[PDB]
Design a protein around this ligand. Structure first.
Ligand SMILES: CC(=O)c1ccc(N2C[C@@H](C(=O)O)CC2=O)cc1
Length: 358
């Protein structure tokens, strides 16, 4: 690797691992479109398995970027429209409060205060219908952003309905396969078990628990190589041969809403580059609090802006992940760890690395 990359990565990540007591970590830096890999520590402490380029990590909420792109692909295929009422694709959602709530609102956490989690008690499709029927919005649709797995989760489930495919089937055939993400999974197959890192929470080895709409929201597991490829695809969508997928990526990076300096995409989130990193490290967009923020509609959405800091953070009980890239500069980073640690620390490291290389 170029020595500048080697040096900035090792000098930034090594103390991060110390400070945060992270058992294992993988990092990819995309520089001038080409990936460079770095690993530390252990995928499995008890069995002394090292982190490698083939180690599978739980992406947690970084999964939403895949959901956003799959949804974008569905729009490009003419199967759904983001302007469509939720009830067009779920006719049994007859409750009044659903009047005026569109697929756009679900995809961007702006439906009017859908809760963070689908309750663990929801097990059947009937249970799921009752949950959404009984939910009472705090705000009119398209006025406030409140991060919610129940929001984008429902978007994901509904987006695939016209295809007749299950969410998994659609993600595999329309996103993973075409992009050659052959070590990226919604359900980790037995063949890949040996590569699946354990997450660590309070010293215990843990994997993510199953839940309703888990696949759509926080269900993807992937290697550092595959995540690098994902970043490459998002940095330069025009190099992708499948036309609906290329368009899907572009739609996911469009700017639909603004809060402060932040713009909400489909899964992806964006800030204008050059970035003042204060808001994403210390301020209103540092992701520590669950925050209800008034949004200003971008009418219509600005197409993918090349000079953007495009990013998503993610966690599960036992994992922490971060992805950021700057299309203009052909530059990106992926950070995967098998311990959940604070988002501001993750963003601080990513900024330090990318700012040095930009
Ligand atoms: C305290 C808490 O449960 C909590 C849950 C989710 C979040 N959010 C809100 C999201 C965001 O604001 O970007 C991301 C994220 O993890 C923040 C706090």
């Amino acid at each position: 690797a170029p020595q500048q990359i080697n040096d900035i990565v090792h000098r930034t990540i090594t103390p991060l691992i110390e400070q945060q007591k992270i058992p294992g970590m993988a990092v990819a830096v995309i520089y001038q479109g080409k990936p460079y890999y770095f690993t530390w520590g252990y995928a499995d402490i008890a069995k002394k398995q090292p982190v490698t380029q083939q180690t599978l990590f739980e992406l947690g909420s970084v999964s939403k970027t895949f959901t956003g792109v799959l949804g974008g692909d569905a729009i490009a295929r003419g199967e759904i429209k983001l302007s469509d009422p939720t009830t067009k694709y779920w006719p049994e959602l007859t409750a009044k409060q659903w009047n005026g709530i569109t697929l756009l609102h679900l995809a961007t956490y702006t439906a009017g205060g859908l809760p963070l989690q689908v309750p663990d008690e929801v097990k059947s499709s009937s249970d799921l219908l009752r949950f959404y029927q009984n939910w009472q919005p705090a705000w009119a649709p398209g006025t406030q952003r409140l991060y919610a797995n129940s929001s984008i989760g429902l978007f994901g489930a509904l987006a695939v309905k016209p295809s007749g495919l299950s969410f998994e089937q659609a993600m595999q055939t329309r996103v993973f396969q075409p992009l050659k993400l052959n070590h990226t999974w919604i359900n980790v197959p037995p063949a890949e078990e040996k590569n699946y890192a354990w997450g660590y929470r309070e010293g215990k080895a843990v994997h993510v628990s199953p839940g309703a709409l888990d696949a759509e929201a926080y269900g993807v597991k992937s290697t550092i190589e595959d995540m690098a490829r994902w970043v490459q695809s998002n940095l330069k969508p025009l190099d992708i041969n499948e036309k609906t997928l290329q368009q899907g990526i572009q739609l996911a990076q469009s700017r639909y809403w603004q809060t402060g300096d932040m713009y909400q995409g489909l899964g992806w989130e964006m800030l204008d580059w050059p970035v003042n990193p204060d808001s994403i490290i210390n301020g209103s967009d540092n992701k520590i609090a669950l925050a209800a923020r008034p949004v200003k509609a971008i009418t219509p959405p600005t197409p993918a802006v090349r000079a953007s800091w495009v990013h998503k953070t993610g966690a599960t009980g036992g994992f922490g992940s971060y992805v950021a890239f700057i299309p203009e500069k052909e530059l990106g980073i992926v950070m995967l760890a098998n311990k959940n640690y604070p988002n501001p620390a993750r963003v601080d490291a990513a900024w330090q690395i990318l700012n040095a290389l930009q």
